[PDB]
Short mmCIF file of C-alpha atoms and ligand atoms in Angstrom, two decimals:
data_model
loop_
_atom_site.label_atom_id
_atom_site.label_comp_id
_atom_site.label_asym_id
_atom_site.label_seq_id
_atom_site.Cartn_x
_atom_site.Cartn_y
_atom_site.Cartn_z
CA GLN D 1 59.70 23.56 -14.06
CA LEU D 2 57.52 26.66 -14.73
CA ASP D 3 58.57 29.79 -12.79
CA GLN D 4 58.12 28.80 -9.10
CA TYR D 5 55.81 25.86 -10.05
CA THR D 6 56.78 22.21 -10.31
CA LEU D 7 54.40 20.55 -12.78
CA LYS D 8 53.01 17.15 -11.87
CA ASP D 9 50.39 14.71 -13.22
CA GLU D 10 47.29 15.50 -15.26
CA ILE D 11 44.32 15.20 -12.92
CA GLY D 12 41.30 16.18 -15.03
CA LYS D 13 40.00 17.39 -18.39
CA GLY D 14 37.15 19.88 -18.71
CA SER D 15 35.52 21.32 -21.84
CA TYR D 16 38.91 22.78 -22.85
CA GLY D 17 42.51 21.93 -22.12
CA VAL D 18 43.98 19.76 -19.38
CA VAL D 19 44.07 20.33 -15.64
CA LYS D 20 47.26 19.31 -13.93
CA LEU D 21 48.59 19.25 -10.41
CA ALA D 22 51.34 21.76 -9.66
CA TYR D 23 53.44 22.52 -6.58
CA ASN D 24 54.55 26.05 -5.77
CA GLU D 25 58.03 25.88 -4.19
CA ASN D 26 57.76 29.45 -2.74
CA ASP D 27 54.56 29.07 -0.65
CA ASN D 28 54.58 25.27 -0.33
CA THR D 29 51.08 25.02 -1.77
CA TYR D 30 49.59 22.71 -4.33
CA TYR D 31 47.61 24.29 -7.15
CA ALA D 32 45.50 23.07 -10.05
CA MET D 33 46.75 24.38 -13.38
CA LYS D 34 44.57 24.52 -16.51
CA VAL D 35 46.89 24.32 -19.53
CA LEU D 36 45.66 25.60 -22.91
CA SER D 37 47.47 25.35 -26.23
CA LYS D 38 46.81 28.45 -28.34
CA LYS D 39 47.72 26.76 -31.62
CA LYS D 40 45.49 23.83 -30.76
CA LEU D 41 42.56 26.14 -30.12
CA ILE D 42 43.18 27.91 -33.41
CA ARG D 43 43.68 24.72 -35.43
CA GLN D 44 40.59 23.08 -34.00
CA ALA D 45 38.55 26.27 -34.57
CA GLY D 46 39.61 25.82 -38.17
CA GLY D 47 37.57 27.63 -40.80
CA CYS D 48 34.95 28.45 -38.18
CA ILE D 49 33.70 31.99 -38.51
CA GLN D 50 32.36 33.30 -35.22
CA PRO D 51 31.71 36.67 -33.54
CA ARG D 52 34.42 35.84 -30.97
CA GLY D 53 37.76 34.13 -31.66
CA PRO D 54 39.04 31.07 -29.75
CA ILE D 55 41.73 33.04 -27.88
CA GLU D 56 39.25 35.82 -27.26
CA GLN D 57 36.86 33.36 -25.56
CA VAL D 58 39.65 32.27 -23.26
CA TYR D 59 40.15 35.87 -22.19
CA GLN D 60 36.43 36.23 -21.53
CA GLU D 61 36.56 33.17 -19.26
CA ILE D 62 39.55 34.68 -17.41
CA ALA D 63 37.58 37.94 -16.92
CA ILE D 64 34.62 35.99 -15.52
CA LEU D 65 36.87 34.03 -13.14
CA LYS D 66 38.56 37.23 -11.89
CA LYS D 67 35.18 38.51 -10.62
CA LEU D 68 34.52 35.45 -8.43
CA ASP D 69 35.33 35.22 -4.73
CA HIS D 70 33.04 32.75 -2.93
CA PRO D 71 33.60 29.61 -0.81
CA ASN D 72 31.48 27.44 -3.17
CA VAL D 73 33.20 28.58 -6.39
CA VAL D 74 36.75 27.86 -7.59
CA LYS D 75 39.37 30.58 -7.19
CA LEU D 76 41.64 31.74 -9.99
CA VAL D 77 44.99 32.81 -8.46
CA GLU D 78 47.06 33.76 -11.49
CA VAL D 79 47.39 33.63 -15.28
CA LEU D 80 50.74 32.88 -16.96
CA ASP D 81 50.66 34.25 -20.50
CA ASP D 82 53.63 35.01 -22.73
CA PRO D 83 52.89 36.31 -26.25
CA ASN D 84 55.98 34.37 -27.41
CA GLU D 85 54.86 30.99 -25.92
CA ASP D 86 52.09 28.69 -27.20
CA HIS D 87 50.77 27.57 -23.83
CA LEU D 88 48.64 29.61 -21.47
CA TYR D 89 48.41 28.60 -17.78
CA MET D 90 45.49 29.37 -15.51
CA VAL D 91 46.45 28.69 -11.90
CA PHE D 92 43.66 27.86 -9.46
CA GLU D 93 43.50 26.95 -5.78
CA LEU D 94 43.27 23.17 -5.43
CA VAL D 95 40.07 21.52 -4.18
CA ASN D 96 41.62 18.40 -2.68
CA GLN D 97 39.05 15.59 -2.95
CA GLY D 98 38.07 15.97 -6.66
CA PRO D 99 34.66 15.58 -8.35
CA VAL D 100 31.77 14.67 -6.11
CA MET D 101 30.45 12.01 -8.54
CA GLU D 102 30.97 10.52 -12.02
CA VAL D 103 27.79 9.37 -13.75
CA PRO D 104 26.62 6.72 -14.01
CA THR D 105 27.39 5.02 -10.67
CA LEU D 106 26.02 2.12 -8.67
CA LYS D 107 26.84 3.93 -5.42
CA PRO D 108 24.80 7.14 -5.35
CA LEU D 109 24.73 9.58 -2.47
CA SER D 110 22.34 9.23 0.45
CA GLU D 111 19.52 11.79 0.69
CA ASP D 112 21.29 13.54 3.59
CA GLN D 113 24.63 13.67 1.72
CA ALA D 114 22.79 15.02 -1.38
CA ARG D 115 21.10 17.76 0.65
CA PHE D 116 24.42 18.83 2.14
CA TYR D 117 26.03 19.17 -1.33
CA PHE D 118 22.89 20.64 -2.93
CA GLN D 119 22.90 23.45 -0.36
CA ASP D 120 26.45 24.33 -1.39
CA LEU D 121 25.39 24.26 -5.04
CA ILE D 122 22.47 26.64 -4.38
CA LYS D 123 24.76 29.11 -2.59
CA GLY D 124 27.38 28.98 -5.32
CA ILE D 125 24.82 29.49 -8.09
CA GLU D 126 23.00 32.27 -6.27
CA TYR D 127 26.41 33.96 -6.07
CA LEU D 128 27.14 33.42 -9.78
CA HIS D 129 23.73 34.81 -10.76
CA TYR D 130 24.28 37.75 -8.39
CA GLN D 131 27.59 38.40 -10.18
CA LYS D 132 25.76 38.23 -13.51
CA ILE D 133 27.24 34.89 -14.59
CA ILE D 134 25.44 31.90 -16.07
CA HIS D 135 27.55 28.75 -15.63
CA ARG D 136 25.94 26.67 -18.41
CA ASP D 137 27.70 23.41 -17.49
CA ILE D 138 26.42 22.42 -14.08
CA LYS D 139 26.91 18.70 -13.53
CA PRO D 140 28.26 16.47 -10.77
CA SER D 141 31.73 16.03 -12.35
CA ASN D 142 32.20 19.84 -12.31
CA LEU D 143 31.46 20.04 -8.55
CA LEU D 144 34.71 19.56 -6.64
CA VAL D 145 34.83 18.47 -2.98
CA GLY D 146 37.33 20.31 -0.75
CA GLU D 147 39.26 18.92 2.20
CA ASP D 148 36.56 20.52 4.42
CA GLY D 149 33.81 18.48 2.69
CA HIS D 150 32.17 21.40 0.85
CA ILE D 151 31.51 21.78 -2.87
CA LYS D 152 33.13 24.28 -5.22
CA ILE D 153 31.77 24.97 -8.72
CA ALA D 154 34.35 24.53 -11.49
CA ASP D 155 34.71 24.68 -15.30
CA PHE D 156 33.74 28.13 -16.59
CA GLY D 157 34.70 27.27 -20.22
CA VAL D 158 31.19 27.80 -21.62
CA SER D 159 30.01 30.37 -19.07
CA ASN D 160 28.81 33.86 -19.98
CA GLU D 161 28.40 37.25 -18.51
CA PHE D 162 25.09 39.16 -18.88
CA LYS D 163 24.27 42.83 -18.37
CA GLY D 164 20.64 42.72 -17.23
CA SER D 165 18.37 41.01 -14.70
CA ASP D 166 18.84 37.82 -16.72
CA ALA D 167 20.76 36.54 -19.73
CA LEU D 168 19.01 36.19 -23.07
CA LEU D 169 20.69 33.40 -25.00
CA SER D 170 20.26 31.73 -28.38
CA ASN D 171 23.06 29.16 -28.54
CA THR D 172 23.47 25.62 -27.24
CA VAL D 173 26.52 24.80 -25.12
CA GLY D 174 27.63 22.44 -22.36
CA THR D 175 27.04 18.78 -21.68
CA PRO D 176 24.10 17.30 -23.68
CA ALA D 177 22.52 15.29 -20.83
CA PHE D 178 22.24 18.50 -18.73
CA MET D 179 20.90 20.86 -21.46
CA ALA D 180 17.42 22.34 -20.95
CA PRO D 181 14.62 21.61 -23.51
CA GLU D 182 14.30 25.35 -24.48
CA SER D 183 17.93 25.49 -25.62
CA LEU D 184 17.49 22.43 -27.83
CA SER D 185 14.10 23.48 -29.27
CA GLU D 186 13.91 25.26 -32.66
CA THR D 187 10.66 26.95 -31.50
CA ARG D 188 12.45 28.73 -28.61
CA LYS D 189 14.92 31.03 -30.41
CA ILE D 190 15.87 32.92 -27.23
CA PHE D 191 15.81 31.67 -23.63
CA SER D 192 16.49 32.73 -20.02
CA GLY D 193 19.99 31.90 -18.76
CA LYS D 194 19.04 31.38 -15.11
CA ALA D 195 16.44 28.78 -15.99
CA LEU D 196 19.10 26.75 -17.87
CA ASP D 197 21.26 26.55 -14.73
CA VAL D 198 18.21 25.47 -12.69
CA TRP D 199 17.36 22.70 -15.14
CA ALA D 200 20.98 21.47 -14.95
CA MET D 201 20.88 21.72 -11.13
CA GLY D 202 17.78 19.48 -11.36
CA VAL D 203 19.48 16.89 -13.54
CA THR D 204 22.44 17.07 -11.12
CA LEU D 205 20.28 16.39 -8.04
CA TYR D 206 18.57 13.44 -9.77
CA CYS D 207 22.07 12.12 -10.52
CA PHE D 208 23.13 12.63 -6.89
CA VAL D 209 20.39 10.31 -5.51
CA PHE D 210 19.93 7.83 -8.36
CA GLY D 211 23.44 7.62 -9.80
CA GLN D 212 22.00 7.94 -13.34
CA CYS D 213 20.67 10.63 -15.68
CA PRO D 214 16.93 11.24 -16.13
CA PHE D 215 17.35 11.32 -19.91
CA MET D 216 19.96 9.30 -21.80
CA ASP D 217 20.70 7.80 -25.14
CA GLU D 218 23.83 6.66 -27.00
CA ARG D 219 22.92 8.83 -30.05
CA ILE D 220 23.03 12.56 -29.15
CA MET D 221 20.18 13.43 -31.53
CA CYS D 222 17.92 10.97 -29.68
CA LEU D 223 19.04 12.37 -26.34
CA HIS D 224 17.93 15.84 -27.49
CA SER D 225 14.53 14.42 -28.44
CA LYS D 226 14.12 12.68 -25.10
CA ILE D 227 14.99 15.85 -23.19
CA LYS D 228 12.30 17.72 -25.14
CA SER D 229 9.62 15.04 -25.33
CA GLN D 230 10.13 12.17 -22.81
CA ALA D 231 8.23 12.39 -19.51
CA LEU D 232 10.36 12.57 -16.37
CA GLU D 233 10.41 9.13 -14.77
CA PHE D 234 12.03 8.17 -11.46
CA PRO D 235 13.67 4.80 -10.84
CA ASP D 236 12.08 2.40 -8.32
CA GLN D 237 15.31 2.19 -6.29
CA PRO D 238 16.40 3.89 -4.22
CA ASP D 239 12.96 4.82 -2.90
CA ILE D 240 13.33 8.56 -2.25
CA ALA D 241 11.15 10.96 -0.28
CA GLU D 242 8.12 12.48 -2.05
CA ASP D 243 9.56 15.68 -0.73
CA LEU D 244 12.69 15.35 -2.90
CA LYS D 245 10.72 13.96 -5.80
CA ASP D 246 8.61 17.14 -5.91
CA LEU D 247 11.65 19.45 -5.95
CA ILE D 248 13.30 17.53 -8.83
CA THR D 249 10.03 17.50 -10.80
CA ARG D 250 9.73 21.29 -10.53
CA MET D 251 13.38 21.83 -11.47
CA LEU D 252 12.88 19.53 -14.48
CA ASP D 253 9.66 21.24 -15.60
CA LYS D 254 10.12 21.42 -19.38
CA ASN D 255 8.46 24.85 -19.50
CA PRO D 256 11.08 27.44 -18.37
CA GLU D 257 8.36 29.97 -17.43
CA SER D 258 6.72 27.71 -14.80
CA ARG D 259 10.03 26.12 -13.71
CA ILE D 260 11.02 26.74 -10.11
CA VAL D 261 13.49 29.61 -9.58
CA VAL D 262 16.41 29.77 -7.17
CA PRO D 263 14.61 31.93 -4.53
CA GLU D 264 11.85 29.27 -4.41
CA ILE D 265 14.39 26.38 -4.29
CA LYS D 266 16.06 27.97 -1.22
CA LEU D 267 12.78 27.69 0.73
CA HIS D 268 11.75 24.23 -0.50
CA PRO D 269 10.97 21.85 2.44
CA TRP D 270 13.47 19.23 1.21
CA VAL D 271 16.35 21.71 0.94
CA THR D 272 15.67 23.18 4.38
CA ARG D 273 14.64 19.97 6.21
CA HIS D 274 11.31 21.76 6.79
CA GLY D 275 12.87 24.95 8.20
CA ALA D 276 15.54 23.23 10.35
CA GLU D 277 18.41 24.18 7.96
CA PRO D 278 17.50 27.50 6.30
CA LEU D 279 19.86 29.04 3.75
CA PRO D 280 21.33 32.51 4.24
CA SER D 281 19.77 35.48 2.46
CA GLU D 282 21.06 36.59 -0.91
CA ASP D 283 22.89 39.58 0.64
CA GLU D 284 24.41 37.46 3.43
CA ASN D 285 25.62 34.87 0.88
CA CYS D 286 26.68 37.26 -1.97
CA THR D 287 27.84 40.65 -0.59
CA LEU D 288 28.77 39.53 2.90
C1 F6J F 1 36.64 19.02 -15.03
C2 F6J F 1 37.55 19.90 -14.21
C3 F6J F 1 38.93 19.30 -14.33
C4 F6J F 1 37.52 21.29 -14.81
C5 F6J F 1 38.42 22.33 -14.22
C6 F6J F 1 38.87 22.21 -12.91
C7 F6J F 1 39.71 23.14 -12.33
C8 F6J F 1 40.17 22.99 -10.96
C9 F6J F 1 40.41 24.07 -10.13
N1 F6J F 1 40.79 23.61 -8.91
C10 F6J F 1 40.78 22.23 -8.95
N2 F6J F 1 41.09 21.42 -7.93
C11 F6J F 1 41.00 20.12 -8.24
C12 F6J F 1 40.65 19.56 -9.45
C13 F6J F 1 40.56 18.10 -9.68
C14 F6J F 1 41.08 17.18 -8.77
C15 F6J F 1 40.99 15.82 -8.96
C16 F6J F 1 40.37 15.33 -10.08
C17 F6J F 1 39.84 16.21 -11.01
C18 F6J F 1 39.94 17.57 -10.80
C19 F6J F 1 40.35 20.47 -10.45
C20 F6J F 1 40.42 21.82 -10.21
C21 F6J F 1 40.08 24.23 -13.08
C22 F6J F 1 39.64 24.37 -14.37
C23 F6J F 1 38.81 23.43 -14.96
C24 F6J F 1 38.42 23.70 -16.37
O1 F6J F 1 38.61 22.81 -17.24
O2 F6J F 1 37.97 24.85 -16.62
#
């Protein structure tokens, strides 16, 4: 159908475009293909005036993805781009089992299953931050489970690259239920990028064990208010360890300055099973 690829069914939809299953007849491998329509992006952008154009943002995402080579992050294999054709194809390695969870759910993960996946998430995010990338859309439906049972981070549509020790950001992107209070607040005009990913990791972990979001409303403007102003409250069931409760509370600290950072999360008693399952060092995980 397309070069050496046989296109198959649509399997997911991220922030942009459609992901479909494809089969490469030359290497007998299945791939996931993100398909973008250039005219669609331009039409939908409309009269919007922005520093960066819609097609330009796509190229920035491609550049980000080309940097990444880690077992807990998706792998971009190829880009098929013809200036004459409307569609652009981003070919990724397939992660066979799909999203770890869709929220809400009546069947959440056990505490042990959540720890296993949360460890993968920590390693993948430590790597992204090491590579100077803020994901900005961490949520359970963007965490794909491989055939080997491990998580890979996907959907870099709203991600950005930063030059310094941290990213200094002023705009609000991603999924509303996972957005940090700082990003939504008019008082906080700029905010740390790393702390946004940690907040979203916190919402994600709460989702893992409870099958529901900490903050939710049908009206998005109310949801923003609850994120900023509603106290974190845990459900009665399942009854989780105080251990885990403490970690989630610190990740969902509404003040980004006192919020727990990734190097502290790595050593948290819940994550490590009190030192039984320690994570590798930053260098071992990122440049090894
Ligand atoms: C929400 C998600 C679709 C976002 C996404 C996923 C992938 C992707 C890479 N390798 C994959 N292997 C499996 C699946 C999958 C399988 C079953 C069900 C759903 C997804 C997806 C991928 C690439 C780009 C994007 C994006 O939009 O930027």
